[PDB]
Amino acid sequence: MSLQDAEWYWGDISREEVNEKLRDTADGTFLVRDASTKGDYTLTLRKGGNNKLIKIFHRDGKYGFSDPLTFSSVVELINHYRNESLAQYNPKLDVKLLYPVSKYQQDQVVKEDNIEAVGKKLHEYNTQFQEKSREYDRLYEEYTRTSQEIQMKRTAIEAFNETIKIFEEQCQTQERYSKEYIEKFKREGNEKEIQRIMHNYDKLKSRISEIIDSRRRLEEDLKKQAAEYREIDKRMNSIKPDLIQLRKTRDQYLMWLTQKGVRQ
Amino acid sequence: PPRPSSGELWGIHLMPPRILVECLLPNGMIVTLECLREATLITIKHELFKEARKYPLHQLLQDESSYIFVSVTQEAEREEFFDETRRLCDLRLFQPFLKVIEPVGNREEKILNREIGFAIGMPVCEFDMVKDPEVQDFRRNILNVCKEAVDLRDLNSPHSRAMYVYPPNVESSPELPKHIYNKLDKGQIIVVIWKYTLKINHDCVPEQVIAEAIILKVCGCDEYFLEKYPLSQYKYIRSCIMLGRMPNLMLMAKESLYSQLPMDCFTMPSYSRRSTKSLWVINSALRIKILCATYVNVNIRDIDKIYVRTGIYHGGEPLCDNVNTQRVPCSNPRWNEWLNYDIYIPDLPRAARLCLSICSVKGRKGAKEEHCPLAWGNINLFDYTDTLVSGKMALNLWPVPHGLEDLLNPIGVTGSNPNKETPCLELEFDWFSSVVKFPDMSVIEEHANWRENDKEQLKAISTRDPLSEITEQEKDFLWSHRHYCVTIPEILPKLLLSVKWNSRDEVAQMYCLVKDWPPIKPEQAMELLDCNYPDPMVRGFAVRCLEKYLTDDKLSQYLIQLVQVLKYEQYLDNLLVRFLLKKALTNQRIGHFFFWHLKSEMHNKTVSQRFGLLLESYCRACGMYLKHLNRQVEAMEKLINLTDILKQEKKDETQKVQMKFLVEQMRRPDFMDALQGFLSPLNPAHQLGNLRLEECRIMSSAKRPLKLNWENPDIMSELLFQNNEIMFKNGDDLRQDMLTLQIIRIMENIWQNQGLDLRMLPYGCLSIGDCVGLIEWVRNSHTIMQIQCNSHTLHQWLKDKNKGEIYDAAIDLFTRSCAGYCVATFILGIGDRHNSNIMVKDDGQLVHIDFGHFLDHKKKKFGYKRERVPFVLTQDFLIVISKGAQECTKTREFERFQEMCYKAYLAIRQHANLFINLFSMMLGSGMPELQSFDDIAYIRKTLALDKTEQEALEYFMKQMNDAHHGGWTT
Ligand SMILES: C[C@@H]1COCCN1c1cc(N2CCOC[C@@H]2C)nc2nc(-c3ccccn3)[nH]c12
């Protein structure tokens, strides 16, 4: 049959469109398109998680991957290797053309024949896409801001921990040096000097209690902000799949509109 | 960790004039002392010990001189303050307290590590905690590169030291372009040495210009002619010839400069002091066990199930089909499934890597089910010791970068996420009763030893661009003639793509070809360093090409990409990083930007450890320039704190109030000392002397950028520039515009060499941190809208400004500026231009600002598959080019303008390999507009690489006609 009516023939699509149509596909998935030079035919085959390009040369109405060009039509060349392996041609490629990417399923998204109907629907989709795009970009800002402030708070908490260790080292230092002097003043009857040491110790303990409580309040803030990060992260992991599909539906309605209108 | 902010205290951007400071004496007492915010530690320690007598146990305190202060910094470090001349407000204290202790340990070593930690933005002591043996081995082993440089730096006595501090800023070739040489009088140039004007040859050596007097330095900056390079090859002289400027130079005695050299001395740090089955012997397939994960962030109703997607990768290409685990619910992330891959273990290449990710599947709309990656992680299958991984392993996963839609991220960095508050995936590799290792090159070289029509093809394949399609037939054709390719060395990249990297037989053979492969040009070797060529042998050959044929100015010109490709390296200790570190330590102009490119990404946790270790090794050996770099860092830190105050606590105040606050703060002693007398990060040859406060002003824009003005303290500053103006931006990511200006600077270099004086003004632009950077302020420039505040308005402004004989000079500059910008913007796809994006100088030089997005950035927002013409020459621009003539499209000036655009477009098209490779080396940079090789496809269309050279010119002429609505003819 004609190559235009064949499903796996896509005409003038780029290597990038093929990559997306073959992204994460199983070995054996294939499609045929025109040459980027624009043999005028390139076969793309999925094998080993890669996209292998196989050029289809054309000499005097004869086709083939290499000369001698045995086949007379790209359809007969494709169907033959759809039923036999590619190892007979090149041993590195040991697979067959099994799963075809059809232009039939691409036409199933758009469900309106009228050009005014596709255009009206395109405007709806493109409107929704910009709405969800601006929504996503706002969530991303909150995501970045929250992630940064969480890192700031955690570093500050590390600083609180080291500060408290230093102030607690002071208490031990004062305890060591005192007692020896506290005992001497007790025999020396200088009770006023005992109170000055005791008062300075109470001044150190209260400052320590305040620093500890500043760290506790910061830890409570970190607990609340960490929960807000998880919620933002969830709301983004949910709109990301929807934004992709919405953009692709928008792009297909653009494709339908271009192919249905005058071209150069 | 790195500082949360740049304020003087945690939660406080500015200390009050006076502040209470808790002092912890060594006797246990705590003294509350009131200090001035700008008081020094030697003063605070003096007042503290006079006050300490009024407190108990004062007798057992020693002399003031026997103690120093210690406190916790905002980086959570316990910093000992050995320099007691520092002010309280400059200490970066977390809280206002000081502890008194006696100094202990190696004092000189602690002072250096603190200075290195300041420049890095991270305390050096954190590297000592790293348990990873690869990190420690890097810190020790990298020192031999440091020792080599400091030895090669002080062996020629003064000279070798000077060439380091003031390297010659010369071209890569002394050959003078035709249009440059024609500006000379019979092959000679007139130069003025400070007035003693004289005419001398252009090929003459500086020493013979000195003999013509009856060391040299450029007037107004710190550039010195310290080598016998042809005076024309020096960039300053080469530029004066093109622009027709009089080269004003200065002479001085070599002893007057050699005395200012500080005999840089490197000292070995403290960390320097303090069975295996072959991979080919193994006989089994590759299998990995995905044990479990801890958690994932997604609500249970909007996502059906979750699974782990894995894949064995060799750079960007998978070595075999990807393998998914079973789909489990979000709440029970446990698999314990031995995933089997279709790859035989002995065929695993050296650079083999595992790329995995936790994905969410939601099959709820038709038959198409959406897959979204939640987290990702990469692991080198061989560690830095050629040892295959075995046993169990825990891996903390990274967030998915913005814009990435693929389910895996093989471009990403390897290793675990240092943030342990993230999903953690536990893996388990198998074991073979012993250690597994890669076989040595000598113990594998035996495995490898174990026409005309074809010539026309091979030559044509090497002329292709690095991203052109490569069919499987052409791969077999390249692999079949892999021994005849040595005559055409430039074909190596295409040949390496033809190898079956999942086959030990073909890999071993390719090793023996690159071992004895003739060196290729540097611009072609850089391709072998991108994410497509991960193998060590391949990357080693590329490094050796740069070592032999990469000049210092091309190294400085391509330094951005060469730093970015460091992220692609599997391991910290590689030949590329040793080469780059060596050059940074032997050329200070290279080291300056080497430091700032690394420093600007220390906030990025994906590379902070790698770039932190590299910065440590550099600062530890860069000599006396560490002092100047710290002066630059603290200057930027106070500008960050100032702009943080204006955009946070004072964002709802008028500019009259903010300026009053600005001039008040900028007049303080601590602020004047930090922001006066230091080298400009945009160009260390420029000295930022004292501030001109009357010219500094907050810009009336949403982002609130700051325009700053310094005096040029050079004696002959009148010859070049007296005002040094810079815009300081805090909030806008400038990496994209730093890259765009670099590419434009590279494009202008290509045009000048091909004899096309398409003069461009590539002003400086440098990113120094997260959304913080500097931009050189072009003097005497105004926006096109400002000029209009009629079609001849722009032309009359250039008439009123430059009158008489100056008219012809300005029109030529405006026209030649459009040619470059018109071509560069269309090729790169810069954001559309308008009367505010475009500016003009009084001399006619056109300056585009805020390039913003580039490549097909609108294709995602609006799926219009068309190449845009961002810079459309309005009627205003055509009148200026035509010298005011109506029917501008039909004028002789417009015909020459088109000839420039046509020649420049083909010129860049002829060097398309370089530009494709430059972008390819940025794929792991983090710019959402440049994530995959499919994003680079935009310049393959604008340059029409899939068409003939005549078709490309017709394509460019069609794009220009369709955007200007006719007028372009050939
Ligand atoms: C440094 C440049 C070029 O020399 C002239 C001054 N200058 C600028 C003036 C500039 N304005 C002049 C017109 O009024 C508006 C504003 C105050 N707006 C700039 N936006 C950027 C820029 C560049 C790259 C990335 C991000 N933003 N640069 C700019």
mmCIF file of C-alpha atoms in Angstrom, chain A residues 15-16 19 23-27 33 36-37 42 48-50 52-55 57 65 89-90 92 126 129-130 136-137 140 143 148 151-152 154-156 158-160 162-163 166-167 169-170 173-174 177-178 181 185 193 196-197 200 203-204 207 218 229-230 233-234 237-238 240-242 244-245 247-248 250-251 254 264, chain B residues 1-2 4 10 22 24-32 54-57 60 72-76 78 94-95 97 99 295 297-299 302-303 309 317-318 320-322 362 365 370 372-374 399-400 402 405-407 419 421 467-473 475-476 500 770 859-864 934 937 940 946 958:
data_model
loop_
_atom_site.group_PDB
_atom_site.id
_atom_site.type_symbol
_atom_site.label_atom_id
_atom_site.label_comp_id
_atom_site.label_asym_id
_atom_site.label_seq_id
_atom_site.Cartn_x
_atom_site.Cartn_y
_atom_site.Cartn_z
ATOM 1 C CA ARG A 15 14.482 13.188 15.672
ATOM 2 C CA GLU A 16 13.270 14.794 18.908
ATOM 3 C CA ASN A 19 12.690 10.321 20.841
ATOM 4 C CA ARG A 23 10.888 7.271 25.247
ATOM 5 C CA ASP A 24 10.922 4.276 27.620
ATOM 6 C CA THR A 25 9.431 1.971 24.980
ATOM 7 C CA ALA A 26 10.141 -1.751 24.841
ATOM 8 C CA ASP A 27 12.706 -3.197 22.455
ATOM 9 C CA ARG A 33 10.054 9.111 8.949
ATOM 10 C CA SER A 36 16.481 15.235 8.314
ATOM 11 C CA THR A 37 18.469 16.259 5.237
ATOM 12 C CA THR A 42 14.932 6.855 8.240
ATOM 13 C CA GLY A 48 18.598 -1.816 24.598
ATOM 14 C CA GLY A 49 17.097 1.426 25.848
ATOM 15 C CA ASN A 50 18.443 3.293 22.811
ATOM 16 C CA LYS A 52 18.892 3.119 16.584
ATOM 17 C CA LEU A 53 18.701 5.018 13.293
ATOM 18 C CA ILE A 54 18.587 2.828 10.170
ATOM 19 C CA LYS A 55 18.739 4.678 6.854
ATOM 20 C CA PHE A 57 18.443 4.197 0.718
ATOM 21 C CA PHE A 65 19.259 -0.922 4.287
ATOM 22 C CA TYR A 89 21.557 -7.797 8.088
ATOM 23 C CA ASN A 90 23.844 -6.780 10.981
ATOM 24 C CA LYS A 92 24.851 -6.293 16.452
ATOM 25 C CA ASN A 126 -4.069 26.675 26.223
ATOM 26 C CA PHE A 129 -2.218 25.329 30.640
ATOM 27 C CA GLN A 130 -1.174 28.904 31.432
ATOM 28 C CA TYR A 136 3.135 25.561 39.356
ATOM 29 C CA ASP A 137 5.692 28.377 39.177
ATOM 30 C CA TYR A 140 8.021 26.233 43.007
ATOM 31 C CA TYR A 143 9.186 25.177 47.464
ATOM 32 C CA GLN A 148 16.286 27.262 51.917
ATOM 33 C CA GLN A 151 18.472 24.674 55.765
ATOM 34 C CA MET A 152 19.053 28.002 57.525
ATOM 35 C CA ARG A 154 19.013 23.568 60.786
ATOM 36 C CA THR A 155 22.363 25.373 60.683
ATOM 37 C CA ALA A 156 21.188 27.763 63.404
ATOM 38 C CA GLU A 158 23.667 23.388 65.095
ATOM 39 C CA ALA A 159 24.960 26.752 66.325
ATOM 40 C CA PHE A 160 22.626 26.651 69.333
ATOM 41 C CA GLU A 162 27.581 24.344 70.146
ATOM 42 C CA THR A 163 26.755 27.488 72.133
ATOM 43 C CA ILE A 166 30.257 26.107 75.658
ATOM 44 C CA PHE A 167 27.978 27.572 78.333
ATOM 45 C CA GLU A 169 31.443 23.948 79.992
ATOM 46 C CA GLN A 170 31.425 27.217 81.950
ATOM 47 C CA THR A 173 34.566 25.229 85.097
ATOM 48 C CA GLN A 174 32.922 27.374 87.777
ATOM 49 C CA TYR A 177 37.241 26.402 90.698
ATOM 50 C CA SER A 178 34.537 27.015 93.306
ATOM 51 C CA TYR A 181 37.227 28.746 97.372
ATOM 52 C CA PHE A 185 35.403 31.521 102.582
ATOM 53 C CA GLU A 193 31.746 36.341 98.912
ATOM 54 C CA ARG A 196 28.608 36.765 94.966
ATOM 55 C CA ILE A 197 29.780 33.422 93.564
ATOM 56 C CA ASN A 200 27.042 34.725 89.290
ATOM 57 C CA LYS A 203 23.234 34.323 86.302
ATOM 58 C CA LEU A 204 24.950 31.632 84.224
ATOM 59 C CA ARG A 207 21.243 32.459 80.535
ATOM 60 C CA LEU A 218 13.467 27.232 66.758
ATOM 61 C CA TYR A 229 7.743 21.441 52.815
ATOM 62 C CA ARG A 230 6.292 17.930 52.577
ATOM 63 C CA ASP A 233 6.300 18.750 47.706
ATOM 64 C CA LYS A 234 3.116 16.672 47.481
ATOM 65 C CA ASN A 237 4.276 15.924 42.564
ATOM 66 C CA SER A 238 0.533 16.019 41.767
ATOM 67 C CA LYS A 240 3.535 17.993 37.506
ATOM 68 C CA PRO A 241 1.874 14.972 35.813
ATOM 69 C CA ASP A 242 -1.240 17.016 35.029
ATOM 70 C CA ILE A 244 2.638 17.551 31.247
ATOM 71 C CA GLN A 245 -0.528 15.941 29.882
ATOM 72 C CA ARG A 247 0.707 20.686 27.517
ATOM 73 C CA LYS A 248 0.715 17.628 25.248
ATOM 74 C CA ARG A 250 -2.506 21.581 23.838
ATOM 75 C CA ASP A 251 0.313 20.686 21.440
ATOM 76 C CA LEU A 254 -1.958 22.884 17.569
ATOM 77 C CA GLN A 264 3.166 27.721 2.604
ATOM 78 C CA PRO B 1 27.637 24.673 57.377
ATOM 79 C CA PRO B 2 27.577 27.717 55.085
ATOM 80 C CA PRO B 4 22.389 31.223 56.560
ATOM 81 C CA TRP B 10 21.685 35.439 63.721
ATOM 82 C CA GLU B 22 28.332 37.972 77.602
ATOM 83 C CA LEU B 24 32.909 33.790 79.813
ATOM 84 C CA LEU B 25 36.066 34.111 81.891
ATOM 85 C CA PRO B 26 38.313 31.069 82.448
ATOM 86 C CA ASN B 27 37.523 31.169 86.188
ATOM 87 C CA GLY B 28 33.852 30.327 85.567
ATOM 88 C CA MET B 29 32.515 33.869 85.950
ATOM 89 C CA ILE B 30 30.243 35.411 83.316
ATOM 90 C CA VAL B 31 30.620 39.169 82.790
ATOM 91 C CA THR B 32 28.070 41.247 80.868
ATOM 92 C CA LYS B 54 35.066 43.562 90.227
ATOM 93 C CA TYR B 55 34.005 39.885 90.101
ATOM 94 C CA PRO B 56 34.865 36.850 92.246
ATOM 95 C CA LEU B 57 37.942 34.677 91.717
ATOM 96 C CA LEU B 60 43.425 33.260 89.388
ATOM 97 C CA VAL B 72 30.347 30.268 67.852
ATOM 98 C CA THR B 73 30.067 31.669 64.336
ATOM 99 C CA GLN B 74 26.961 31.667 62.149
ATOM 100 C CA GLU B 75 28.508 28.632 60.420
ATOM 101 C CA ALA B 76 28.231 26.746 63.746
ATOM 102 C CA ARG B 78 34.054 27.413 67.259
ATOM 103 C CA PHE B 94 25.866 33.513 66.065
ATOM 104 C CA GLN B 95 25.044 35.070 69.457
ATOM 105 C CA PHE B 97 29.039 36.139 73.609
ATOM 106 C CA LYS B 99 34.713 32.938 75.705
ATOM 107 C CA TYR B 295 9.365 7.573 52.616
ATOM 108 C CA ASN B 297 6.164 12.867 49.652
ATOM 109 C CA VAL B 298 2.854 12.553 47.792
ATOM 110 C CA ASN B 299 -0.781 12.308 48.865
ATOM 111 C CA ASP B 302 -3.730 11.776 43.694
ATOM 112 C CA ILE B 303 -1.125 9.044 43.032
ATOM 113 C CA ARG B 309 13.220 2.831 38.013
ATOM 114 C CA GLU B 317 23.482 6.183 26.887
ATOM 115 C CA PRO B 318 22.049 3.095 28.602
ATOM 116 C CA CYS B 320 21.088 -2.167 28.482
ATOM 117 C CA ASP B 321 17.324 -1.931 28.859
ATOM 118 C CA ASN B 322 16.091 -0.180 31.985
ATOM 119 C CA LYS B 362 -1.062 7.203 38.245
ATOM 120 C CA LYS B 365 -7.001 8.773 32.597
ATOM 121 C CA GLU B 370 1.415 9.285 33.878
ATOM 122 C CA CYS B 372 6.529 11.362 37.526
ATOM 123 C CA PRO B 373 9.937 11.075 39.226
ATOM 124 C CA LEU B 374 9.923 11.882 42.940
ATOM 125 C CA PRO B 399 14.954 16.328 44.591
ATOM 126 C CA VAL B 400 14.070 16.304 40.905
ATOM 127 C CA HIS B 402 13.006 21.947 37.950
ATOM 128 C CA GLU B 405 10.538 15.370 32.917
ATOM 129 C CA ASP B 406 12.559 12.190 32.338
ATOM 130 C CA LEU B 407 12.149 9.410 34.886
ATOM 131 C CA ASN B 419 20.797 16.050 53.584
ATOM 132 C CA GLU B 421 16.170 14.400 55.983
ATOM 133 C CA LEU B 467 24.986 16.217 17.518
ATOM 134 C CA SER B 468 24.290 15.202 13.910
ATOM 135 C CA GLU B 469 22.446 11.948 13.298
ATOM 136 C CA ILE B 470 24.562 8.792 13.083
ATOM 137 C CA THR B 471 22.940 5.739 11.515
ATOM 138 C CA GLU B 472 23.820 2.191 12.516
ATOM 139 C CA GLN B 473 25.286 1.599 9.048
ATOM 140 C CA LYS B 475 28.561 3.089 12.918
ATOM 141 C CA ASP B 476 29.580 -0.214 11.329
ATOM 142 C CA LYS B 500 29.676 -1.156 21.619
ATOM 143 C CA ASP B 770 22.996 32.046 44.449
ATOM 144 C CA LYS B 859 8.267 26.251 22.674
ATOM 145 C CA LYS B 860 7.257 24.843 26.068
ATOM 146 C CA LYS B 861 4.994 27.770 26.977
ATOM 147 C CA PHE B 862 3.523 28.009 23.459
ATOM 148 C CA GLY B 863 4.015 24.985 21.226
ATOM 149 C CA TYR B 864 4.899 27.037 18.142
ATOM 150 C CA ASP B 934 17.336 18.177 22.589
ATOM 151 C CA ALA B 937 18.891 21.249 18.835
ATOM 152 C CA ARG B 940 21.250 23.219 14.902
ATOM 153 C CA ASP B 946 21.271 19.820 8.134
ATOM 154 C CA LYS B 958 14.246 34.141 4.592
#
